[PDB]
Every structure is written in C-alpha cells, then in structure tokens.
Structure 1
Amino acid sequence: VHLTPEEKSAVTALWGKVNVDEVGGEALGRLLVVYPWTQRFFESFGDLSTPDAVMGNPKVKALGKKVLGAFSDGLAHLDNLKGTFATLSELHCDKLHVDPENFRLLGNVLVCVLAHHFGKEFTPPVQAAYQKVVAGVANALAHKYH
C-alpha cells in the first residue's frame, strides 16, 4: 500500500518545511488535551491541568521533539518500519502497555497539526500520503502486540 513517487515527493517537500523543535510537542500536547486518558502515562511531567499548561509544558515539548524524530526516521525507512520501530515497540508495548489504538490517534493528531500549520498546502492528496505514513508507523510500533 506504500507511497507512489508522487506521494513521496508531496510528503518530503512538506516535511522539509516542518519546524522540528515545535511540531512534535504540538502533536503530543494536543493528544493529551484531546484524549485526556493519555495523561495517565505522564504523571511525572508535572502541570497538565489546562490546555495552556499542557502545550507550554517543557517536558511535553521535549518528548514531542523525540516523537517527531521517530516519524522523521520512519519517513527515511518506509520500507523497513518494523526494524526502525523495534526498540520503540518493545518500549511502548512490553514496558509501557500503551494500547496501540493510541498510536493511531497520535498519528491522526499529527495530521491535524500539519493541516493547521500548512493550511491549503495540505491538500487531500497530500493528507492521503501522510495517512499511509502514520498508519505505517502505528502498525510498526504495535508490532510487539502482533
């Protein structure tokens, strides 16, 4: 199901314009705000009591940056997402017990964040390509459950 050359182009062009210090934290922050049960995994992160607290929380932004880097990784290895995500899969599945449905949600949140930030540049074909990516990443990250 993976990307056509045209989709790869669309995806890399847009991703090149992404601020890697902000977008990851924006996505993680929104996950915590929009799907509040996810906060259960972040009891050590301090103040998450309001949308503003969550988005400006430095631990959230820091972790977000790491998440975005994994997506970047993923983008660079679309043909071996399983190997790329093995250690992360062990972590999130074997150690953390995160339900894999949450991997789908985070990926979709990231898609919403890209739409918010690129607006009309984030066309329906461009989103279609990105959905393949986030689906791929989610599936790979869930591998330890399969």
Structure 2
Amino acid sequence: VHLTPEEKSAVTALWGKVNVDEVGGEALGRLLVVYPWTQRFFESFGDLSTPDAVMGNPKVKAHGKKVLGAFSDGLAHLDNLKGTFATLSELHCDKLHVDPENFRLLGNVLVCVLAHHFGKEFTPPVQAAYQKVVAGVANALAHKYH
C-alpha cells in the first residue's frame, strides 16, 4: 500500500491526538470480546469470559499498549511497512504461531475504536486513509510467514 500526501497528512494529524495509554487496550479488548476465538492466544491473561472481565483486565491493557506502540512505529515508516515489521512478522509466525487473518480483525476493531473515540472527526475520507493503513500493517505483519 502507498498513501497520497493528503492521506498521510490526515493519518498523522489524527494519530497525534491518540492517547497511547488507552486506545491500544480498548482495541485489543474489543478484539477479544467481538471475536472471542482470538482469546486462544491469551490464556495467560486469565478470565476473558465476559466483556467486563476482558475490558478491565490489566494484562489486556498492558499488552494493548505495546501493540499500539508498534503500530505507532509503523506510522513513522509508511513507505516501508514490510521492512519495519519484518522482525515482528517473523516473531508472530515462528514463535507465536498467530494466523495473520487475526491482524485484519484487529485492524477492523481499531478503526471502530478511532471512530468511537473521535466521532464526527473520523470522516469517511479519514476512515478510508486508515483502512489503507491497517491493511498495510496487516499485510506487513503477514509478509514473513512461510
């Protein structure tokens, strides 16, 4: 994926307002609630059996912060997502055994979280730019699978 200069500007402007301590835990929690089969990868988190248990789980929050920090790193290298994420792609394949289809689900939920948090500011053109971003990140994270 490649973004036009206007899309890059819109992505970067919105992201500068994203709360680093919160959006990641919200997105990861919603992934686990909306698509509960994804809980298979997170047994060590403990009880994930209700929305309240997931959303308040401190390990969900801490892990989501790391996931979104890596996402933030990708936004600093939008022309080189595959290179930027190659080590993490290898990790998710070789060590974590994560089906990359899950990366697309997390992108779905992240877009919903941005829309929920920002409201009307998350316009249809801003969403379209973020859809390119989350697709690019998912594709980059899938790239070193074999």
Q: SS at 1:144's partner residue?
A: coil
Cα offset, 1:87, TM superposition: 1.6
For 1:51-100, what per-residue CA distance to the aligned partner results, in whole angstroms no more than 9, with x for missing partners? 01101101000000011111101100011111211121111111122111
- Please, which runs of 5 or more residues in structure 1 have no aligned partner? none
Moved over 2 A (4+): none
Q: CA RMSD in A?
A: 1.0
Contact 2:90 2:145 in 1 (8 A): no
Over the matched positions of the two proteins, sequence identity in percent amounts to: 99
Q: SS at 2:90's partner residue?
A: helix
- Please, which runs of 5 or more residues in structure 2 have no aligned partner? none
Give the match for residue 53 of structure 1: 53
2-side partners of 1:18 and 1:144: how far apart? 29
TM-score (norm 1): 0.96
Number of corresponding residues: 146
1-side partners of 2:136 and 2:106: how far apart? 13
Cα offset, 1:12, TM superposition: 1.0
Contact 1:3 1:129 in 2 (8 A): yes
TM-score (norm 2): 0.96
1-side partners of 2:80 and 2:2: how far apart? 11
Cα offset, 1:115, TM superposition: 0.3
Contact 1:94 1:144 in 2 (8 A): no
